[PDB]
């Protein structure tokens, strides 16, 4: 079966409207028949029965604001209009995941839906985005993240979407600012994938459904989109590839085609493990069809071999270097 836009507003309204267990029926869902209250740094406000103290704004995305808060810290994802969809996705993901996996993602504890917006209450990750981390390295002598950390993060990402895809979900927006580092990093274990607002639940579609939308909700395109070919899970493969590209070169990935072979731009000078990375980008960017998705496990093993061959000893020195950079930015 074929579907135009998996992010279409009327489509999501209908998918939610016809759920056996609609978001409105969750025990941790709360509906309110009033406007979204004003939310501001270092200020209290009423969120249902509870009074909530907001600290400072943690970050801003394409659609929403995420603040730190307490009544154990947690976050408030605030969005206009309301986004019950992200809450639905988050709920399903945590249901379908093996409990040992859930630490790689962000739990939503509750959702407060209003007439014109929503507040999603979720888990906190305290040490900024991967995009930010990449920026922190730009302002150092070394300029780029070390290979040990890059290969490490890359493997975790491959592992992450492997778990997500196993739940038959598509993240749909895998990029540097949707990866967060938490305090679990102080003790790749602390890396978390967040922002499920553009995610797709394939279980809500017939077996073998594919999509033809030639672009994302903010202009970005994956490989199949650039060729007007169909796609489902490939969009996440592209996202991971683009993310690792950004860790490697500090800029956003652009692709070219040469003889039916898709590959990222750049002359790849100053790039170590050139053979490993070319094989990585080859497999990630040249997916024949929706039926022949490359083994995420296999990709990660190839990175693991190189990692084990060069960086087992040194990862401790590398993560320390980063934590120092992270703490400096947080206290700032
Ligand atoms: N769990 C979290 N802990 C700390 N900051 C977060 C968390 N989740 C998101 N953020 C910050 O909020 C920003 C926007 O949130 P996100 O979920 O990406 O919404 P959007 O869909 O608008 O991108 C992110 O870029 C990130 O910096
Ligand atoms: Mg985001
Ligand atoms: Mg989003």
């Amino acid at each position: 079966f074929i579907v135009g836009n998996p992010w279409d507003d009327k489509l999501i309204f209908k998918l939610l409207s016809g759920l056996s267990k609609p978001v409105s029926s969750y025990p941790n869902t709360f509906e309110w028949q009033c406007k979204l209250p004003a939310i501001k740094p270092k200020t209290e406000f009423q969120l249902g029965s509870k009074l909530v103290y907001v600290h400072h704004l943690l970050g801003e995305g394409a659609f929403a604001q995420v603040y730190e808060a307490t009544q154990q810290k947690f976050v408030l994802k605030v969005q206009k209009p309301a986004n019950p969809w992200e809450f639905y996705i988050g709920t399903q993901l945590m249901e379908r995941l093996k409990p040992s996996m859930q630490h790689m993602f962000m739990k939503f504890y509750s959702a407060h839906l209003f007439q014109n917006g929503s507040v999603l209450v979720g888990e906190l990750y305290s040490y900024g985005t991967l995009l930010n981390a990449i920026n922190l390295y730009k302002n150092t002598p070394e300029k780029v993240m070390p290979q040990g950390l890059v290969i490490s993060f890359a493997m975790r990402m491959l592992y992450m979407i492997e778990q997500v895809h196993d739940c038959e979900i598509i993240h749909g927006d895998i990029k540097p600012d949707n990866f967060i580092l938490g305090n679990g990093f102080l003790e790749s274990a602390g890396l978390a994938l967040i922002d499920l607002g553009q995610s797709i639940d394939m279980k809500l579609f017939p077996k073998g459904t594919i999509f033809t939308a030639k672009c994302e909700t903010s202009g970005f395109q994956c490989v199949e989109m650039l060729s007007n070919k169909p796609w489902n899970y490939q969009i996440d493969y592209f996202g991971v590839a683009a993310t690792v590209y950004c860790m490697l070169f500090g800029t956003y990935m652009k692709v070219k085609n040469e003889g039916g072979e898709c590959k990222p731009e750049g002359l790849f000078r100053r790039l170590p493990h050139l053979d490993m990375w070319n094989e990585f980008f080859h497999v990630m960017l040249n997916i024949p069809d929706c039926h022949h998705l490359p083994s995420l496990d296999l990709l990660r093993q190839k990175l693991k071999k190189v990692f084990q061959q060069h960086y087992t000893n040194k990862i401790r020195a590398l993560r320390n270097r980063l934590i120092v950079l992270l703490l400096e930015c947080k206290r700032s």
Side-chain angles (χ1 to χ4, degrees):
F1 292 81
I2 294 178
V3 175
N5 183 12
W7 305 293
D8 172 78
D9 286 333
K10 286 190 171 184
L11 176 59
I12 291 173
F13 185 79
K14 294 162 193 180
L15 288 181
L16 292 173
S17 289
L19 289 177
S20 292
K21 296 189 293 177
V23 168
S24 64
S25 75
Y26 300 169
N28 57 340
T29 291
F30 300 92
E31 301 162 285
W32 308 111
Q33 296 135 335
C34 63
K35 302 295 184 174
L36 177 71
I39 302 177
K40 192 177 187 188
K42 305 168 193 165
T43 305
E44 277 183 348
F45 80 106
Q46 198 66 18
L47 188 58
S49 77
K50 306 174 184 182
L51 191 66
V52 171
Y53 186 67
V54 178
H55 296 220
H56 52 74
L57 171 65
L58 293 165
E60 265 185 302
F63 304 100
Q65 291 68 42
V66 177
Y67 308 80
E68 198 178 46
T70 59
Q71 276 178 215
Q72 182 64 75
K73 298 176 182 171
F74 54 81
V75 298
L76 302 185
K77 174 156 186 177
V78 190
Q79 187 169 348
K80 296 193 196 180
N83 194 342
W85 175 255
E86 174 159 18
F87 195 55
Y88 164 80
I89 295 294
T91 306
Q92 299 318 125
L93 180 61
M94 292 301 174
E95 281 188 8
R96 300 169 194 177
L97 282 167
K98 331 190 199 304
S100 84
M101 305 292 177
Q102 297 174 13
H103 74 270
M104 299 188 298
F105 309 98
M106 170 195 172
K107 287 180 178 172
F108 298 96
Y109 301 131
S110 63
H112 295 262
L113 309 175
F114 299 82
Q115 297 178 334
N116 61 330
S118 62
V119 186
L120 305 182
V121 191
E123 186 172 357
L124 176 69
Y125 292 89
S126 302
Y127 295 101
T129 68
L130 174 58
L131 178 63
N132 178 78
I134 293 163
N135 286 338
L136 293 176
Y137 279 99
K138 270 185 155 89
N139 288 24
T140 61
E142 49 186 330
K143 287 291 292 185
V144 288
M145 185 184 311
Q147 287 298 291
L149 273 161
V150 171
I151 296 168
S152 179
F153 283 150
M155 287 182 298
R156 181 61 57 163
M157 291 171 183
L158 297 172
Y159 190 65
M160 275 168 171
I161 59 167
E162 185 183 345
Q163 302 314 312
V164 173
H165 289 179
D166 174 72
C167 302
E168 294 191 67
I169 292 170
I170 300 169
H171 186 275
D173 194 25
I174 300 173
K175 64 180 174 184
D177 71 329
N178 287 343
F179 284 100
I180 312 296
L181 286 164
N183 54 18
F185 188 75
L186 281 154
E187 305 162 307
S188 66
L191 188 76
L193 176 54
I194 56 85
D195 193 350
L196 306 173
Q198 310 301 109
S199 298
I200 308 161
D201 183 11
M202 297 298 289
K203 292 193 180 196
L204 296 186
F205 297 118
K207 300 290 181 176
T209 299
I210 58 91
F211 308 116
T212 69
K214 299 168 182 181
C215 70
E216 301 174 17
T217 315
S218 57
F220 307 98
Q221 293 190 328
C222 63
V223 181
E224 292 71 17
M225 288 173 182
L226 291 158
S227 346
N228 304 272
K229 289 172 176 177
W231 59 265
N232 37 37
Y233 289 99
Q234 294 104 315
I235 188 170
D236 285 354
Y237 282 80
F238 181 85
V240 174
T243 299
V244 174
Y245 184 96
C246 191
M247 289 193 291
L248 286 173
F249 296 103
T251 69
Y252 288 126
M253 190 177 68
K254 298 178 181 182
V255 286
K256 73 187 182 181
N257 215 278
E258 277 173 1
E261 176 67 25
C262 181
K263 58 205 293 180
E265 290 184 349
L267 306 178
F268 280 20
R269 297 170 305 174
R270 305 224 105 253
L271 182 62
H273 316 291
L274 175 56
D275 288 346
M276 185 200 72
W277 285 125
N278 274 129
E279 192 189 359
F280 169 84
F281 281 116
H282 167 62
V283 176
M284 293 292 266
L285 298 175
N286 298 263
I287 297 169
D289 62 334
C290 299
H291 297 279
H292 295 78
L293 307 168
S295 178
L296 283 166
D297 187 81
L298 179 64
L299 286 143
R300 186 173 46 84
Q301 297 304 312
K302 288 170 182 173
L303 296 206
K304 198 179 217 294
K305 176 183 177 184
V306 176
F307 180 95
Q308 285 180 337
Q309 175 170 351
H310 294 104
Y311 304 112
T312 62
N313 291 75
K314 311 185 164 197
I315 185 60
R316 215 176 169 184
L318 297 182
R319 68 164 163 181
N320 275 333
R321 168 58 174 167
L322 175 54
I323 293 164
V324 174
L325 296 169
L326 288 172
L327 293 177
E328 196 71 273
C329 173
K330 184 175 171 64
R331 298 179 303 239
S332 170

